[PDB]
């Protein structure tokens, strides 16, 4: 029941962890 | 019962884990 | 039950971890 | 039970870690 | 139990770590 919930709007990707990166341009 | 729910809109994918990266452009 | 919950609106992604970076522009 | 909860509205991303940076503009 | 919880509204994020910086303009 809503154990994991990710809600995003008009946002960049979410990087959770190590050695994670994202370039936005 | 909505155990896991992902909502995205105008956004890149969500990277959950290690050694995960994505280039946006 | 709401073990992990990430809700963001009109914001950049949240980078949690080491050696994680994001360029926004 | 609400082990990790991040809720933000109209804000910049929050970078938690070492060697993490983000430019907003 | 609410080990990690951050909530901000209409404000810049807070960078916690070493060699972390954020330019907002």
Swiss-Prot record, chains A, B, C, D, E:
Gene disruption: observed consequences: Mice exhibit severe multi-organ inflammation and systemic cell death, which causes lethality of animals late in gestation or shortly after birth. Perinatal lethality observed in Ripk1 knockout mice is rescued in knockout mice lacking both Ripk1 and Ripk3; mice however die the first days of postnatal life. Perinatal lethality observed in Ripk1 knockout mice is rescued in knockout mice lacking both Ripk1 and Casp8; mice however die the first days of postnatal life. Only mice lacking Ripk1, Ripk3 and Casp8 survive past weaning and rescue lethality caused by the absence of Ripk1.
PTM characteristics: Cleavage is crucial for limiting TNF-induced apoptosis, necroptosis and inflammatory response. Cleavage abolishes NF-kappa-B activation and enhances the interaction of TRADD with FADD. Proteolytically cleaved by CASP6 during intrinsic apoptosis. RIPK1 and RIPK3 undergo reciprocal auto- and trans-phosphorylation.
Induction, as annotated: In concanavalin A-treated splenocytes.
Functional note: Serine-threonine kinase which is a key regulator of TNF-mediated apoptosis, necroptosis and inflammatory pathways. Exhibits kinase activity-dependent functions that regulate cell death and kinase-independent scaffold functions regulating inflammatory signaling and cell survival. Has kinase-independent scaffold functions: upon binding of TNF to TNFR1, RIPK1 is recruited to the TNF-R1 signaling complex (TNF-RSC also known as complex I) where it acts as a scaffold protein promoting cell survival, in part, by activating the canonical NF-kappa-B pathway.
UniProt note: domains: The death domain mediates dimerization and activation of its kinase activity during necroptosis and apoptosis. It engages other DD-containing proteins as well as a central (intermediate) region important for NF-kB activation and RHIM-dependent signaling.
Family statement: Belongs to the protein kinase superfamily. TKL Ser/Thr protein kinase family.
Protein name: Receptor-interacting serine/threonine-protein kinase 1
Taxonomic lineage from the root: Eukaryota, Metazoa, Chordata, Craniata, Vertebrata
Gene name of this polypeptide: Ripk1
């Amino acid at each position: 029941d809503d154990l994991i919930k990710y809600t995003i709007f008009n946002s960049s990707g979410i990087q959770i962890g190590n050695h994670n990166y994202m370039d936005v341009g």
